[PDB]
Structures are given as C-alpha cells and as structure tokens.
Amino acid sequence: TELLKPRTLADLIRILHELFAGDEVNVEEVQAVLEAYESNPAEWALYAKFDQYRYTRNLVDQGNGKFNLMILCWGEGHGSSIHDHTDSHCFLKLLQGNLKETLFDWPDKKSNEMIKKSERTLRENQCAYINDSIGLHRVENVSHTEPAVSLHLFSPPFDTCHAFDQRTGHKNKVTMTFHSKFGIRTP
C-alpha cells in the first residue's frame, strides 16, 4: 500500500502487478501511480505503432490475468466510437499529445440522439478514469498536427464492448483487435 513514483515504464508495470496482486482495485491509487509516471518516449517507442487510417491498440502487458495494459496510437483526426467498458475499470494516461474525452449517459430504450454530458481535454501525463457506472465516452485526437499516444489499463481484461450510435443510442457489439503484442505486429 506504499506507492512510490515509477522511475520508468518497466518500473510502472512492476508497481501495477503489485497493486493488482489481489481481487479488488484501489482506483485512486492506480490513478495516482499512472499519473506519477513521467512519459519517456524512448521507453515506449516499441509499442507506438501507428496506422494511417485509424487508431491502433498495442498490448504492452497482460497483467498476469488481472489487467490489460496497452498503448493506443491516434493519428491526426483519429477517434473512437462512443463506447462502454464491459463492467471493467478503465484508466487512460496521456503519453503524448492531447485527447478530447466526451461523456455520454447510458441511453434510454427510446431512440434519441445521445447528447454530450460534458467534455474535457486530457493533456500529456494526465490520467483519466472511467467505468460503466460513471457513463460512456468517446475519445478523440482532434489535432490536425500532433499524433496522440495513450496508455490504457483495463481491469479485468476484456476484448469485446459496445459501440453506440450517437443518433439513436442503439448499441452493437464490437470485438477489440490488437495491432501488436509485446512490440510484435500481429495482423
């Protein structure tokens, strides 16, 4: 329960394996530790694999079954769907650039446009947190000039979630695909 500042990405990962050694999750502590790591591009260049047309998901660590740690790479103008997180914890730390996070409420059964609840700009080294009881969100690199890179921790791991149609609130199931694993391209 003694949180030290992660010196490196590797150190961070080791501290995370400690924090998730058990069955439950201290959210505020995981968030603090993630925010405390100072992004060092050299340490994660291996995982920062971009695609021209959409954002990529790059597996960094499998957290001995308790979590998935991954790096997402967002080209200029790349963004996600409005999505949930499959009853898991979601931590999002910026390693490079900025991302816009837009919050949505869970839709009612009636077909209505999903109106934004709020939005915020996540900046380098900032760490955000979301879960399904908080709501839904969309994440976007709105920059025309700067690629964005983020570090995501999901616990428990999941490889499916829902995307929501902003016009209706209708949801469809989506399967998450890894662009790379441990620095190896996995087409």
Nearest Cα to Cα of residue 44 among 65, 69, 20, 63: 69
Residue ranges at the known binding site: 83, 85, 137
Q: Residue 68 CB: number of other CB atoms within 10 A? A: 22
Options 18, 51, 87, 113; binder of Na ion; rule CB under 5 A: 51
Minimum distance between the CB of residue 57 and Na ion, rounded to whole angstroms?
4
* Near Na ion by CB under 5 A: residue from 31, 33, 95, 97: 97
- Could you say which of 15, 20, 33, 78 contacts Na ion (CB under 5 A)? 78
Stretch that binds Na ion, among 19-27, 109-117, 121-129, 148-156 (CB under 5 A): 148-156
Among 130, 125, 98, CA closest to 34: 125
Please give the C-alpha separations between residue 25 and each of 50, 62, 92, in angstroms, as whole numbers: 31, 16, 15
Nearest CA among 22, 77, 58 for reference residue 180 = 58
- Specify the 3-state DSSP secondary structure of 180: strand
Contacting residues toward Na ion, per CB under 5 A:
8-10, 37-38, 43, 47, 50-51, 54-58, 73, 75, 78, 84-85, 97-98, 100, 102, 132, 138, 140-141, 143, 146, 148, 173, 179-180, 183
